[PDB]
Amino acid sequence: TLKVCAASDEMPYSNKQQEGFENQLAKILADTMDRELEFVWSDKAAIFLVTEKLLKNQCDVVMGVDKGDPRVATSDPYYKSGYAFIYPADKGLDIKNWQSPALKDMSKFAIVPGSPSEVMLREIDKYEGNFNYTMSLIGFKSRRNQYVRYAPDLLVSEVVSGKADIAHIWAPEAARYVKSASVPLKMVVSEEIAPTRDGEGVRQQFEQSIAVRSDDQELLKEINTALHKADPKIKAVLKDEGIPLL
Ligand SMILES: [Br-]
């Protein structure tokens, strides 16, 4: 069997109903390895899958982490994507990158804190004026909110509604919602490394890999073999989802 650590409520990646794109990928990976797929569901956000499940031996595979994540062994990358600007189409907006003068005329930015989006918002001096807006959207832990859910469809919706001038979101998180949007949206993928005046370049594009525990080297080899074998099916799922592939 292939025991896959997965979030029970983190669309579009995963849910207990197996409707997320990584749930589909897990099925492909298990089939290709001739194993029976067994999900191990977490009630926490997917960002905790590595530390609370995988590294505690509750399951053996995490479907998506950045290549080279120090905490784990990572497979050959099975795709690369990036953070992207998301804004209404047909409004004559010229937005290609973080140096676009258009961004300077905006005030409401739908972003995820702790992401490269935050680093760049500070860089262009819009972070402070956008803080209250961002905090009205993103959930944090409290006594009343022990399981802090991540909903990127909310951020896309803010652009559709016009409450956000623009969003800057990890594209795999946003892609299906940009497609199903009720008004036409543009999704422009950021440059790989965004320049900053004083700091260093801020990476906006990331290779994604399967993760296993660092000592699970034999499993890792089987995974790499399967990934190469199933590559067309894997890429097809990702493309169907609407994910920009770099
Ligand atoms: Br950029």
PDB file of C-alpha atoms and ligand atoms in Angstrom:
ATOM      1  CA  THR A   1       0.000   0.000   0.000  1.00  0.00           C
ATOM      2  CA  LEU A   2       0.955   3.657  -0.463  1.00  0.00           C
ATOM      3  CA  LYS A   3       0.055   5.662   2.633  1.00  0.00           C
ATOM      4  CA  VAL A   4      -0.459   9.265   1.538  1.00  0.00           C
ATOM      5  CA  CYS A   5      -0.684  12.080   4.090  1.00  0.00           C
ATOM      6  CA  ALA A   6      -3.480  14.415   2.902  1.00  0.00           C
ATOM      7  CA  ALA A   7      -5.573  17.316   4.118  1.00  0.00           C
ATOM      8  CA  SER A   8      -9.271  16.644   4.564  1.00  0.00           C
ATOM      9  CA  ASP A   9     -10.230  20.249   3.688  1.00  0.00           C
ATOM     10  CA  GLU A  10      -7.739  22.102   1.505  1.00  0.00           C
ATOM     11  CA  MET A  11      -9.136  22.600  -1.984  1.00  0.00           C
ATOM     12  CA  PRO A  12      -8.106  22.749  -4.687  1.00  0.00           C
ATOM     13  CA  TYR A  13      -5.272  20.449  -3.547  1.00  0.00           C
ATOM     14  CA  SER A  14      -7.179  17.911  -1.491  1.00  0.00           C
ATOM     15  CA  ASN A  15     -10.293  17.017   0.469  1.00  0.00           C
ATOM     16  CA  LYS A  16     -11.708  13.940   2.228  1.00  0.00           C
ATOM     17  CA  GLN A  17     -13.950  13.379  -0.822  1.00  0.00           C
ATOM     18  CA  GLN A  18     -10.809  13.038  -2.964  1.00  0.00           C
ATOM     19  CA  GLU A  19     -11.913  15.918  -5.191  1.00  0.00           C
ATOM     20  CA  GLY A  20      -8.611  17.822  -5.123  1.00  0.00           C
ATOM     21  CA  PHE A  21      -5.974  17.693  -7.878  1.00  0.00           C
ATOM     22  CA  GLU A  22      -3.372  16.104  -5.578  1.00  0.00           C
ATOM     23  CA  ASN A  23      -5.891  13.392  -4.701  1.00  0.00           C
ATOM     24  CA  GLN A  24      -5.990  12.527  -8.406  1.00  0.00           C
ATOM     25  CA  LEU A  25      -2.195  12.592  -8.561  1.00  0.00           C
ATOM     26  CA  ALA A  26      -2.001  10.235  -5.585  1.00  0.00           C
ATOM     27  CA  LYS A  27      -4.192   7.707  -7.402  1.00  0.00           C
ATOM     28  CA  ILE A  28      -1.962   7.879 -10.485  1.00  0.00           C
ATOM     29  CA  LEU A  29       1.165   7.479  -8.328  1.00  0.00           C
ATOM     30  CA  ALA A  30      -0.230   4.467  -6.431  1.00  0.00           C
ATOM     31  CA  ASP A  31      -1.555   2.765  -9.603  1.00  0.00           C
ATOM     32  CA  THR A  32       1.807   3.252 -11.320  1.00  0.00           C
ATOM     33  CA  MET A  33       3.614   1.666  -8.370  1.00  0.00           C
ATOM     34  CA  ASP A  34       1.084  -1.181  -8.251  1.00  0.00           C
ATOM     35  CA  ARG A  35       0.082  -0.279  -4.704  1.00  0.00           C
ATOM     36  CA  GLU A  36      -3.245   0.137  -2.967  1.00  0.00           C
ATOM     37  CA  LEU A  37      -3.790   3.805  -2.136  1.00  0.00           C
ATOM     38  CA  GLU A  38      -4.451   4.561   1.522  1.00  0.00           C
ATOM     39  CA  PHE A  39      -5.094   8.168   2.521  1.00  0.00           C
ATOM     40  CA  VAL A  40      -4.235   9.323   6.017  1.00  0.00           C
ATOM     41  CA  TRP A  41      -6.366  12.399   6.581  1.00  0.00           C
ATOM     42  CA  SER A  42      -5.373  15.444   8.606  1.00  0.00           C
ATOM     43  CA  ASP A  43      -7.812  17.991   9.996  1.00  0.00           C
ATOM     44  CA  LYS A  44      -5.086  20.609   9.948  1.00  0.00           C
ATOM     45  CA  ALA A  45      -4.024  22.759   6.993  1.00  0.00           C
ATOM     46  CA  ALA A  46      -1.803  21.003   4.423  1.00  0.00           C
ATOM     47  CA  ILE A  47       1.188  23.090   5.525  1.00  0.00           C
ATOM     48  CA  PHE A  48       1.296  20.826   8.644  1.00  0.00           C
ATOM     49  CA  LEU A  49       1.333  17.493   6.779  1.00  0.00           C
ATOM     50  CA  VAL A  50       5.110  17.187   6.871  1.00  0.00           C
ATOM     51  CA  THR A  51       5.683  17.952  10.550  1.00  0.00           C
ATOM     52  CA  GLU A  52       2.607  16.398  12.155  1.00  0.00           C
ATOM     53  CA  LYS A  53       2.083  13.343   9.963  1.00  0.00           C
ATOM     54  CA  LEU A  54       4.999  12.330   7.712  1.00  0.00           C
ATOM     55  CA  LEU A  55       7.820  13.046  10.167  1.00  0.00           C
ATOM     56  CA  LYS A  56       5.816  11.312  12.916  1.00  0.00           C
ATOM     57  CA  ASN A  57       5.447   8.108  10.904  1.00  0.00           C
ATOM     58  CA  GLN A  58       1.658   8.363  10.459  1.00  0.00           C
ATOM     59  CA  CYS A  59       2.071   8.039   6.697  1.00  0.00           C
ATOM     60  CA  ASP A  60       4.833   7.869   4.143  1.00  0.00           C
ATOM     61  CA  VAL A  61       4.198  10.318   1.318  1.00  0.00           C
ATOM     62  CA  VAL A  62       3.382  14.006   1.004  1.00  0.00           C
ATOM     63  CA  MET A  63       2.174  14.943  -2.477  1.00  0.00           C
ATOM     64  CA  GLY A  64       3.580  18.449  -2.900  1.00  0.00           C
ATOM     65  CA  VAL A  65       6.466  20.344  -1.307  1.00  0.00           C
ATOM     66  CA  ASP A  66       9.138  22.633  -2.772  1.00  0.00           C
ATOM     67  CA  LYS A  67      12.005  20.658  -4.319  1.00  0.00           C
ATOM     68  CA  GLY A  68      14.892  20.445  -1.850  1.00  0.00           C
ATOM     69  CA  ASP A  69      12.806  21.113   1.288  1.00  0.00           C
ATOM     70  CA  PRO A  70      15.453  20.449   4.000  1.00  0.00           C
ATOM     71  CA  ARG A  71      13.082  18.521   6.253  1.00  0.00           C
ATOM     72  CA  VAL A  72      12.535  15.556   3.958  1.00  0.00           C
ATOM     73  CA  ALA A  73      13.807  13.724   0.903  1.00  0.00           C
ATOM     74  CA  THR A  74      12.247  15.122  -2.275  1.00  0.00           C
ATOM     75  CA  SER A  75      11.556  13.377  -5.568  1.00  0.00           C
ATOM     76  CA  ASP A  76      12.543  14.633  -8.987  1.00  0.00           C
ATOM     77  CA  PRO A  77      10.268  17.664  -9.500  1.00  0.00           C
ATOM     78  CA  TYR A  78       7.072  16.678 -11.335  1.00  0.00           C
ATOM     79  CA  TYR A  79       6.154  20.263 -12.192  1.00  0.00           C
ATOM     80  CA  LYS A  80       7.117  23.890 -11.816  1.00  0.00           C
ATOM     81  CA  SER A  81       4.714  26.791 -11.386  1.00  0.00           C
ATOM     82  CA  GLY A  82       4.705  30.311 -10.007  1.00  0.00           C
ATOM     83  CA  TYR A  83       2.897  33.021  -8.098  1.00  0.00           C
ATOM     84  CA  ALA A  84       0.715  35.043 -10.472  1.00  0.00           C
ATOM     85  CA  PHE A  85      -1.008  38.423 -10.769  1.00  0.00           C
ATOM     86  CA  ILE A  86      -4.752  38.004 -11.105  1.00  0.00           C
ATOM     87  CA  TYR A  87      -6.874  40.953 -12.260  1.00  0.00           C
ATOM     88  CA  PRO A  88      -9.919  41.745 -14.421  1.00  0.00           C
ATOM     89  CA  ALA A  89      -9.397  41.295 -18.143  1.00  0.00           C
ATOM     90  CA  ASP A  90     -10.453  43.947 -20.659  1.00  0.00           C
ATOM     91  CA  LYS A  91      -9.842  46.854 -18.278  1.00  0.00           C
ATOM     92  CA  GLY A  92      -6.708  47.955 -20.100  1.00  0.00           C
ATOM     93  CA  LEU A  93      -4.513  47.092 -17.114  1.00  0.00           C
ATOM     94  CA  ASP A  94      -0.796  46.703 -17.997  1.00  0.00           C
ATOM     95  CA  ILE A  95       0.667  44.323 -15.409  1.00  0.00           C
ATOM     96  CA  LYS A  96       3.641  42.117 -16.210  1.00  0.00           C
ATOM     97  CA  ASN A  97       5.731  42.112 -13.056  1.00  0.00           C
ATOM     98  CA  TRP A  98       6.389  43.730  -9.679  1.00  0.00           C
ATOM     99  CA  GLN A  99       7.925  46.840 -11.250  1.00  0.00           C
ATOM    100  CA  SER A 100       4.744  47.685 -13.191  1.00  0.00           C
ATOM    101  CA  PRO A 101       3.743  51.298 -12.519  1.00  0.00           C
ATOM    102  CA  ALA A 102       0.080  50.180 -12.520  1.00  0.00           C
ATOM    103  CA  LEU A 103       0.594  48.400  -9.174  1.00  0.00           C
ATOM    104  CA  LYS A 104       1.536  51.805  -7.689  1.00  0.00           C
ATOM    105  CA  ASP A 105      -1.950  53.154  -8.379  1.00  0.00           C
ATOM    106  CA  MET A 106      -3.580  50.269  -6.484  1.00  0.00           C
ATOM    107  CA  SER A 107      -4.331  49.957  -2.758  1.00  0.00           C
ATOM    108  CA  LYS A 108      -6.109  46.611  -2.191  1.00  0.00           C
ATOM    109  CA  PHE A 109      -4.024  43.484  -2.810  1.00  0.00           C
ATOM    110  CA  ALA A 110      -5.373  39.987  -2.165  1.00  0.00           C
ATOM    111  CA  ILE A 111      -2.289  38.051  -0.975  1.00  0.00           C
ATOM    112  CA  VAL A 112      -1.179  35.320   1.429  1.00  0.00           C
ATOM    113  CA  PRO A 113       1.021  36.477   4.339  1.00  0.00           C
ATOM    114  CA  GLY A 114       4.448  34.832   4.537  1.00  0.00           C
ATOM    115  CA  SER A 115       4.528  34.273   0.778  1.00  0.00           C
ATOM    116  CA  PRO A 116       6.867  36.030  -1.708  1.00  0.00           C
ATOM    117  CA  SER A 117       3.839  38.272  -2.376  1.00  0.00           C
ATOM    118  CA  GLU A 118       4.325  39.785   1.066  1.00  0.00           C
ATOM    119  CA  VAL A 119       8.043  40.372   0.505  1.00  0.00           C
ATOM    120  CA  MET A 120       7.259  42.194  -2.754  1.00  0.00           C
ATOM    121  CA  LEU A 121       4.385  44.242  -1.326  1.00  0.00           C
ATOM    122  CA  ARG A 122       6.811  45.599   1.259  1.00  0.00           C
ATOM    123  CA  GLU A 123       9.339  46.186  -1.520  1.00  0.00           C
ATOM    124  CA  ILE A 124       6.903  48.464  -3.383  1.00  0.00           C
ATOM    125  CA  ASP A 125       5.749  50.157  -0.152  1.00  0.00           C
ATOM    126  CA  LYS A 126       2.149  48.944  -0.264  1.00  0.00           C
ATOM    127  CA  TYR A 127       2.336  46.434   2.593  1.00  0.00           C
ATOM    128  CA  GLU A 128       1.389  48.724   5.491  1.00  0.00           C
ATOM    129  CA  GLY A 129      -1.591  50.283   3.729  1.00  0.00           C
ATOM    130  CA  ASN A 130      -2.835  46.828   2.731  1.00  0.00           C
ATOM    131  CA  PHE A 131      -2.351  45.101   6.088  1.00  0.00           C
ATOM    132  CA  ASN A 132      -5.867  45.611   7.487  1.00  0.00           C
ATOM    133  CA  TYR A 133      -7.383  44.375   4.216  1.00  0.00           C
ATOM    134  CA  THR A 134      -5.182  41.224   4.206  1.00  0.00           C
ATOM    135  CA  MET A 135      -5.982  40.478   7.862  1.00  0.00           C
ATOM    136  CA  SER A 136      -9.723  40.691   7.086  1.00  0.00           C
ATOM    137  CA  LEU A 137      -9.283  37.754   4.684  1.00  0.00           C
ATOM    138  CA  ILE A 138      -6.743  35.328   6.153  1.00  0.00           C
ATOM    139  CA  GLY A 139      -7.536  33.124   9.144  1.00  0.00           C
ATOM    140  CA  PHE A 140      -5.201  32.748  12.109  1.00  0.00           C
ATOM    141  CA  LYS A 141      -5.168  30.393  15.081  1.00  0.00           C
ATOM    142  CA  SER A 142      -7.071  31.407  18.225  1.00  0.00           C
ATOM    143  CA  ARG A 143      -8.933  29.660  21.034  1.00  0.00           C
ATOM    144  CA  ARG A 144     -11.979  29.686  18.731  1.00  0.00           C
ATOM    145  CA  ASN A 145     -10.120  28.694  15.565  1.00  0.00           C
ATOM    146  CA  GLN A 146      -7.894  25.696  16.261  1.00  0.00           C
ATOM    147  CA  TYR A 147      -8.021  24.399  12.697  1.00  0.00           C
ATOM    148  CA  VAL A 148      -7.146  27.338  10.479  1.00  0.00           C
ATOM    149  CA  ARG A 149      -8.526  26.669   6.996  1.00  0.00           C
ATOM    150  CA  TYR A 150      -6.881  28.016   3.805  1.00  0.00           C
ATOM    151  CA  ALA A 151      -9.343  29.139   1.111  1.00  0.00           C
ATOM    152  CA  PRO A 152      -7.694  30.675  -1.995  1.00  0.00           C
ATOM    153  CA  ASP A 153     -11.067  30.784  -3.795  1.00  0.00           C
ATOM    154  CA  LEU A 154     -11.907  33.667  -1.436  1.00  0.00           C
ATOM    155  CA  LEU A 155      -8.934  35.649  -2.755  1.00  0.00           C
ATOM    156  CA  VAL A 156      -9.962  35.119  -6.387  1.00  0.00           C
ATOM    157  CA  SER A 157     -13.516  36.125  -5.446  1.00  0.00           C
ATOM    158  CA  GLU A 158     -12.234  39.440  -4.049  1.00  0.00           C
ATOM    159  CA  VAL A 159     -10.904  40.311  -7.505  1.00  0.00           C
ATOM    160  CA  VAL A 160     -14.153  39.251  -9.179  1.00  0.00           C
ATOM    161  CA  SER A 161     -16.053  41.459  -6.715  1.00  0.00           C
ATOM    162  CA  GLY A 162     -13.694  44.393  -7.203  1.00  0.00           C
ATOM    163  CA  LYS A 163     -12.958  44.603  -3.489  1.00  0.00           C
ATOM    164  CA  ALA A 164      -9.390  43.718  -4.398  1.00  0.00           C
ATOM    165  CA  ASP A 165      -7.633  45.700  -7.118  1.00  0.00           C
ATOM    166  CA  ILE A 166      -5.561  42.582  -7.751  1.00  0.00           C
ATOM    167  CA  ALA A 167      -4.436  39.273  -6.287  1.00  0.00           C
ATOM    168  CA  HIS A 168      -1.009  37.695  -6.271  1.00  0.00           C
ATOM    169  CA  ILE A 169      -1.461  34.004  -5.566  1.00  0.00           C
ATOM    170  CA  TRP A 170       0.395  30.716  -6.023  1.00  0.00           C
ATOM    171  CA  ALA A 171      -1.051  29.669  -9.388  1.00  0.00           C
ATOM    172  CA  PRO A 172      -1.922  26.029  -8.604  1.00  0.00           C
ATOM    173  CA  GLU A 173      -4.104  27.326  -5.710  1.00  0.00           C
ATOM    174  CA  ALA A 174      -5.963  29.808  -7.882  1.00  0.00           C
ATOM    175  CA  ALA A 175      -6.168  28.168 -11.303  1.00  0.00           C
ATOM    176  CA  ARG A 176      -9.531  26.399 -11.210  1.00  0.00           C
ATOM    177  CA  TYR A 177     -11.200  29.458  -9.660  1.00  0.00           C
ATOM    178  CA  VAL A 178      -9.792  31.806 -12.287  1.00  0.00           C
ATOM    179  CA  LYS A 179     -11.280  29.525 -14.957  1.00  0.00           C
ATOM    180  CA  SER A 180     -14.713  29.326 -13.318  1.00  0.00           C
ATOM    181  CA  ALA A 181     -14.688  33.062 -12.499  1.00  0.00           C
ATOM    182  CA  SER A 182     -17.947  34.915 -13.164  1.00  0.00           C
ATOM    183  CA  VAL A 183     -16.026  37.745 -14.842  1.00  0.00           C
ATOM    184  CA  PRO A 184     -13.094  37.221 -17.217  1.00  0.00           C
ATOM    185  CA  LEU A 185      -9.776  37.340 -15.350  1.00  0.00           C
ATOM    186  CA  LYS A 186      -6.175  37.506 -16.444  1.00  0.00           C
ATOM    187  CA  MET A 187      -3.585  35.371 -14.684  1.00  0.00           C
ATOM    188  CA  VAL A 188      -0.035  36.533 -15.373  1.00  0.00           C
ATOM    189  CA  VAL A 189       2.727  34.355 -13.929  1.00  0.00           C
ATOM    190  CA  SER A 190       5.540  36.270 -12.198  1.00  0.00           C
ATOM    191  CA  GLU A 191       9.161  36.267 -13.343  1.00  0.00           C
ATOM    192  CA  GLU A 192      11.303  33.539 -11.715  1.00  0.00           C
ATOM    193  CA  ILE A 193      13.296  35.977  -9.579  1.00  0.00           C
ATOM    194  CA  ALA A 194      11.912  39.415  -8.709  1.00  0.00           C
ATOM    195  CA  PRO A 195      14.563  42.120  -8.107  1.00  0.00           C
ATOM    196  CA  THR A 196      14.588  44.255  -4.962  1.00  0.00           C
ATOM    197  CA  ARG A 197      16.359  47.566  -4.365  1.00  0.00           C
ATOM    198  CA  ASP A 198      18.177  46.755  -1.122  1.00  0.00           C
ATOM    199  CA  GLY A 199      17.544  43.066  -0.403  1.00  0.00           C
ATOM    200  CA  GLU A 200      18.207  40.137  -2.751  1.00  0.00           C
ATOM    201  CA  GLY A 201      16.117  38.668  -5.571  1.00  0.00           C
ATOM    202  CA  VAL A 202      12.808  37.107  -4.477  1.00  0.00           C
ATOM    203  CA  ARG A 203      11.950  33.756  -6.108  1.00  0.00           C
ATOM    204  CA  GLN A 204       8.384  33.579  -7.480  1.00  0.00           C
ATOM    205  CA  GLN A 205       8.600  30.227  -9.298  1.00  0.00           C
ATOM    206  CA  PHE A 206       9.059  26.882  -7.521  1.00  0.00           C
ATOM    207  CA  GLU A 207       9.678  23.270  -8.539  1.00  0.00           C
ATOM    208  CA  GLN A 208       7.311  20.866  -6.776  1.00  0.00           C
ATOM    209  CA  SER A 209       8.186  17.347  -5.563  1.00  0.00           C
ATOM    210  CA  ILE A 210       6.781  14.367  -3.674  1.00  0.00           C
ATOM    211  CA  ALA A 211       8.207  14.170  -0.131  1.00  0.00           C
ATOM    212  CA  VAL A 212       9.091  11.149   1.996  1.00  0.00           C
ATOM    213  CA  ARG A 213      11.140  10.871   5.216  1.00  0.00           C
ATOM    214  CA  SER A 214      14.876  11.368   4.567  1.00  0.00           C
ATOM    215  CA  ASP A 215      15.706   7.751   5.452  1.00  0.00           C
ATOM    216  CA  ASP A 216      13.064   6.282   3.093  1.00  0.00           C
ATOM    217  CA  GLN A 217      15.456   6.135   0.181  1.00  0.00           C
ATOM    218  CA  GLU A 218      14.148   2.914  -1.363  1.00  0.00           C
ATOM    219  CA  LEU A 219      10.612   4.316  -1.442  1.00  0.00           C
ATOM    220  CA  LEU A 220      12.015   7.512  -2.991  1.00  0.00           C
ATOM    221  CA  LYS A 221      13.601   5.511  -5.815  1.00  0.00           C
ATOM    222  CA  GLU A 222      10.282   3.761  -6.595  1.00  0.00           C
ATOM    223  CA  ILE A 223       8.546   7.126  -6.576  1.00  0.00           C
ATOM    224  CA  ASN A 224      11.029   8.669  -9.003  1.00  0.00           C
ATOM    225  CA  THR A 225      10.610   5.702 -11.324  1.00  0.00           C
ATOM    226  CA  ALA A 226       6.829   5.976 -11.179  1.00  0.00           C
ATOM    227  CA  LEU A 227       6.859   9.766 -11.722  1.00  0.00           C
ATOM    228  CA  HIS A 228       8.834   9.393 -14.913  1.00  0.00           C
ATOM    229  CA  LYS A 229       6.597   6.529 -16.112  1.00  0.00           C
ATOM    230  CA  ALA A 230       3.347   8.342 -15.374  1.00  0.00           C
ATOM    231  CA  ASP A 231       4.536  11.761 -16.499  1.00  0.00           C
ATOM    232  CA  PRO A 232       1.993  12.219 -19.311  1.00  0.00           C
ATOM    233  CA  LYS A 233      -0.940  11.363 -16.978  1.00  0.00           C
ATOM    234  CA  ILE A 234       0.478  13.573 -14.221  1.00  0.00           C
ATOM    235  CA  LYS A 235       0.920  16.524 -16.588  1.00  0.00           C
ATOM    236  CA  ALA A 236      -2.603  15.954 -17.956  1.00  0.00           C
ATOM    237  CA  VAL A 237      -4.203  16.310 -14.522  1.00  0.00           C
ATOM    238  CA  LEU A 238      -2.236  19.483 -13.854  1.00  0.00           C
ATOM    239  CA  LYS A 239      -3.095  20.992 -17.236  1.00  0.00           C
ATOM    240  CA  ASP A 240      -6.776  20.078 -16.885  1.00  0.00           C
ATOM    241  CA  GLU A 241      -6.761  21.849 -13.529  1.00  0.00           C
ATOM    242  CA  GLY A 242      -5.605  25.004 -15.354  1.00  0.00           C
ATOM    243  CA  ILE A 243      -2.163  25.174 -13.762  1.00  0.00           C
ATOM    244  CA  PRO A 244       0.549  27.104 -15.654  1.00  0.00           C
ATOM    245  CA  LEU A 245       3.480  24.766 -16.185  1.00  0.00           C
ATOM    246  CA  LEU A 246       6.972  26.205 -16.351  1.00  0.00           C
TER     247      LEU A 246
HETATM  248 BR    BR B   1       7.383  39.445 -11.124  1.00  0.00          BR
END
